[PDB]
Ligand binder design. Structure first.
Ligand SMILES: CC(=O)N[C@@H]1[C@@H](O)[C@H](O[C@@H]2O[C@H](CO)[C@@H](O)[C@H](O)[C@H]2NC(C)=O)[C@@H](CO)O[C@@H]1O
Length: 184
């Protein structure tokens, strides 16, 4: 069938700037609720250690009203041709890491869609409003989209956070180490 090969050589995070090294570049539809997003260094203020990819240095901190950002991944531009997406329908894997501070609560949300050439929603993974753990530990969201049918051409990845105390500043969910990949 193989194939496996074409997908193994293309296999890479397809999100640009998953951690904040490039500030907010690569992110579109940025919604700066309250004092907006801010990139901060890894251990944050009343934040726990990220023990997991030592190579991740930073995270995006949300504020006192929803902060949302998104990325649309053009699968053809990343090397996946039409027939391969319509026919094989390879696994599209989507992860995010989020956390909260210890002196204040926060909420987190993620939605990811598989879209067609013309923005038709073929598939969707949604968490709804999530309570971020109060103790400050890091949480992994993971989803694998398979058997999604033909037509998938983009992945739209979107996440957000805000605080739960309505505080001037950056007390909302923190997000980092985001990824989407096509897996063999
Ligand atoms: C959005 C805004 O203007 N929020 C205010 C809060 O920030 C205030 O609460 C206070 O916020 C800070 C962090 O921003 C703390 O360091 C501080 O302890 C805190 N104070 C209190 C009494 O809770 C707020 C309170 O008066 O007023 C706005 O809600």
């Amino acid at each position: 069938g193989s194939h496996f090969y074409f997908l193994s050589k293309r296999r890479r995070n397809l999100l640009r700037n998953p951690a904040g090294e490039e500030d907010l570049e690569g992110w579109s539809d940025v919604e700066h609720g309250g004092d907006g997003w801010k990139v901060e260094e890894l251990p944050g203020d009343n934040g726990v250690e990220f023990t997991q990819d030592d190579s991740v240095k930073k995270y995006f901190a949300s504020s006192f009203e929803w902060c949302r950002k998104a990325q649309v991944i053009d699968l053809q531009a990343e090397g996946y041709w039409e027939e391969l997406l319509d026919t094989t329908q390879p696994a599209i894997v989507v992860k995010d890491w989020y956390s909260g501070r210890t002196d204040a609560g926060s909420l987190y949300e993620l939605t990811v869609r598989l879209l067609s050439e013309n923005e038709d929603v073929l598939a969707e993974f949604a968490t709804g409003q999530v309570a971020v753990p109060e103790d400050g530990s890091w949480m992994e969201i993971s989803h694998t989209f398979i058997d999604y049918g033909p037509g998938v051409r983009f992945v739209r990845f979107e996440h957000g956070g805000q605080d739960s105390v309505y505080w001037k500043g950056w007390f909302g969910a923190r997000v980092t180490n985001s990824s989407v990949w096509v897996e063999p």
